[PDB]
């Protein structure tokens, strides 16, 4: 087994594809730029999910959970 990783990535992005918060989206974009791993088009911006690093994926999970002080 090993698809586990990819499984999460898919489930994560899937859940986000349902979100409606644009602000949170902006923050994520920065996360992708931080890992300096992505592909920006001269007329568009796209990035692979299976290309990001553990750090990014981790930050994304925390973003959705946004569970800080309670």
């Amino acid at each position: 087994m090993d698809k586990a990783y990819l499984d999460e990535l898919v489930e994560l992005h899937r859940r986000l594809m349902t979100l409606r918060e644009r602000h949170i989206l902006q923050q994520i974009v920065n996360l992708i730029e931080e890992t300096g791993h992505f592909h920006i088009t001269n007329t568009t911006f796209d990035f692979d999910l299976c290309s990001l690093d553990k750090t990014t994926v981790r930050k994304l999970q925390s973003y959705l959970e946004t569970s800080g002080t309670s």
């Binding site: 990819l6 992005h13 989206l25 974009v29 007329t43 911006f45 796209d46 692979d48 999910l49 299976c50």
Partner: peptide, 24 residues
């Protein structure tokens, strides 16, 4: 023979995040 290994990629037009495609 007939496996599966699709690439999960997401496209987000900068015109959405940046909000500056070709002005007006």
């Amino acid at each position: 023979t007939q496996g599966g290994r699709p690439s999960l990629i997401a496209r987000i037009p900068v015109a959405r995040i940046l909000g500056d495609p070709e002005e007006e």
